[PDB]
Amino acid sequence: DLPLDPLWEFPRDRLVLGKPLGEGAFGQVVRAEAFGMDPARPDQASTVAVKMLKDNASDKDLADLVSEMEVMKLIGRHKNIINLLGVCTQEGPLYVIVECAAKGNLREFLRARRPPGPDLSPDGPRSSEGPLSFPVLVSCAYQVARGMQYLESRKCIHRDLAARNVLVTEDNVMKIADFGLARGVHHIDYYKKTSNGRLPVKWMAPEALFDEVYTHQSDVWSFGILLWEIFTLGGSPYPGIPVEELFSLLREGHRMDRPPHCPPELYGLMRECWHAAPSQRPTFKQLVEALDKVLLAVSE
Numbered sequence: 001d002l003p004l005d006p007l008w009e010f011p012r013d014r015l016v017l018g019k020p021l022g023e024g025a026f027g028q029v030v031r032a033e034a035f036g037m038d039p040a041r042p043d044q045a046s047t048v049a050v051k052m053l054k055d056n057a058s059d060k061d062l063a064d065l066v067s068e069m070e071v072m073k074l075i076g077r078h079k080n081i082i083n084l085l086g087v088c089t090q091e092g093p094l095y096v097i098v099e100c101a102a103k104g105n106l107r108e109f110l111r112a113r114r115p116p117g118p119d120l121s122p123d124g125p126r127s128s129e130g131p132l133s134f135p136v137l138v139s140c141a142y143q144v145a146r147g148m149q150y151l152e153s154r155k156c157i158h159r160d161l162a163a164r165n166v167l168v169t170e171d172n173v174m175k176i177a178d179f180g181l182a183r184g185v186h187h188i189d190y191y192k193k194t195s196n197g198r199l200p201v202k203w204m205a206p207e208a209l210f211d212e213v214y215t216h217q218s219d220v221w222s223f224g225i226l227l228w229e230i231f232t233l234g235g236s237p238y239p240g241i242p243v244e245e246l247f248s249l250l251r252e253g254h255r256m257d258r259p260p261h262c263p264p265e266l267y268g269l270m271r272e273c274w275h276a277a278p279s280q281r282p283t284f285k286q287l288v289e290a291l292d293k294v295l296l297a298v299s300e
């Protein structure tokens with residue numbers, strides 16, 4: 001069926017499929033054990049994420065997955081993205097094998113690590129000290145920016161950059177996921193709410209939402225939303241605003257308020273990312289540098 005690319009091809013019998021992790025518009029993701037992903041260590045076990053089609057995919061579903069595979073091949077390797085490890089295309093179902101992030105997505109990461117509430121009785125010397133500190137939050141933002149900077153350099157547009165689409169490793173390294181996806185930009189159900197209550201329309205740049213125009217600067221807009229997510233510790237954007245109201249508010253030029261416990265430096269960058277004119281928004285290179293200054297100034 002598909003042609004053999006020996007550079008990326010990996011023997012499917014060296015995979016042991018484990019627990020299903022979730023799914024997207026096309027295909028599902030399954031945790032798996034891989035043996036000898038590194039050819040120098042043929043019997044070495046590693047944990048990977050395997051992308052595959054659902055139980056009757058159309059050929060469009062297959063074409064979407066193949067298209068994702070080819071994007072993954074060309075983009076290359078970077079510390080702050082989910083990297084391609086190998087593929088299974090011969091004699092069996094199509095597998096796209098990618099890096100597995102131990103701690104799940106950034107949204108759930110932050111929400112599970114919100115500071116202890118006012119109802120918890122003080123127990124020990126760190127009763128007020130939550131898992132999340134400001135410099136770590138800044139580092140999360142900086143890493144995502146560096147990852148997006150890399151993707152931009154490889155002429156890759158994400159088109160749904162959000163905390164949900166950023167994954168966290170065992171060492172709290174941010175890795176941008178699903179950057180090479182066909183996302184059906186000409187038939188988006190703008191009112192669609194996910195099973196976890198997400199309204200993806202709230203991450204779209206105005207030119208993307210209103211004009212169906214995607215550039216790297218539209219990703220920058222989304223990054224601004226992601227910044228807001230980070231410093232609300234996994235909050236949902238435009239709180240209490242349904243999609244219909246979002247439409248009119250965006251047309252009136254409405255912007256989100258400065259969230260609590262968020263320094264002006266970071267709300268400043270959010271607002272810059274939300275400039276009406278895409279050219280007036282910072283580039284990811286500028287975002288990386290701007291965030292780095294803050295990160296260094298607080299990393300004594």
Ligand SMILES: *CCC(=O)Nc1cccc(F)c1C(=O)Nc1n[nH]c2ccc(O[C@H](C)c3c(Cl)cncc3Cl)cc12
Nearest residue numbers: 021022023029031049099100101102104105164167177
């Ligand atoms: C193998 C490590 C692992 O199981 N990690 C993990 C545990 C629990 C929940 C998770 F979401 C993960 C995780 O992030 N798995 C994972 N590793 N690489 C991936 C690449 C894509 C992907 O997609 C699924 C659908 C997904 C996304 Cl994009 C975002 N949030 C959750 C999920 Cl399940 C998941 C992984």
